[PDB]
């Protein structure tokens, strides 16, 4: 019985993180969408070429 | 001759007494697992206490 209780506690403890991360990524998606920096486009392609 | 035959009856009576012994052995041995099952349920009762 006690082990079952512990497992349920752990299940909730991990589960919450999933919706938290989903909210975080949705916010990140919104921020990137509002980001309209083709300057960053140029910078990052140059960065890769340097890594290339 | 008759008295000699008569002693033999006593042995049969003793055998019957021994036979009863098995009756009591079984009957009270049953009670052990009776208790076992009943307070096994009591363990289940601690369990749904834990579930509450």
Swiss-Prot record, chain A:
Keywords: ATP synthesis, Cell inner membrane, Cell membrane, CF(0), Hydrogen ion transport, Ion transport, Membrane, Transmembrane, Transmembrane helix, Transport. The keyword Cell membrane applies. It is found in: Cell inner membrane. One of its GO terms (molecular function) is proton-transporting ATPase activity, rotational mechanism. Disulfide bonds: none annotated. One of its GO terms (cellular component) is plasma membrane. Belongs to the ATPase B chain family. F-type ATPases have 2 components, F(1) - the catalytic core - and F(0) - the membrane proton channel. F(1) has five subunits: alpha(3), beta(3), gamma(1), delta(1), epsilon(1). F(0) has three main subunits: a(1), b(2) and c(10-14). The alpha and beta chains form an alternating ring which encloses part of the gamma chain. F(1) is attached to F(0) by a central stalk formed by the gamma and epsilon chains, while a peripheral stalk is formed by the delta and b chains. F(1)F(0) ATP synthase produces ATP from ADP in the presence of a proton or sodium gradient. F-type ATPases consist of two structural domains, F(1) containing the extramembraneous catalytic core and F(0) containing the membrane proton channel, linked together by a central stalk and a peripheral stalk. During catalysis, ATP synthesis in the catalytic domain of F(1) is coupled via a rotary mechanism of the central stalk subunits to proton translocation. This is ATP synthase subunit b. The gene is atpF.
């Amino acid at each position: 019985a006690k082990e079952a209780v512990d497992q349920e506690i752990n299940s909730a403890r991990e589960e919450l993180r999933q919706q938290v991360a989903a909210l975080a990524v949705t916010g990140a998606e919104k921020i990137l969408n509002q980001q309209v920096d083709a300057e960053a486009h140029n910078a990052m392609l140059s960065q890769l070429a340097a890594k290339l | 001759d008759l008295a000699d035959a008569q002693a033999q009856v006593k042995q049969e009576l003793d055998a019957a007494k021994a036979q009863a012994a098995q009756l009591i052995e079984q009957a009270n041995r049953r009670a052990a697992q009776l208790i076992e099952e009943a307070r096994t349920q009591a363990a289940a009762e601690g369990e749904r206490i834990r579930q509450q």
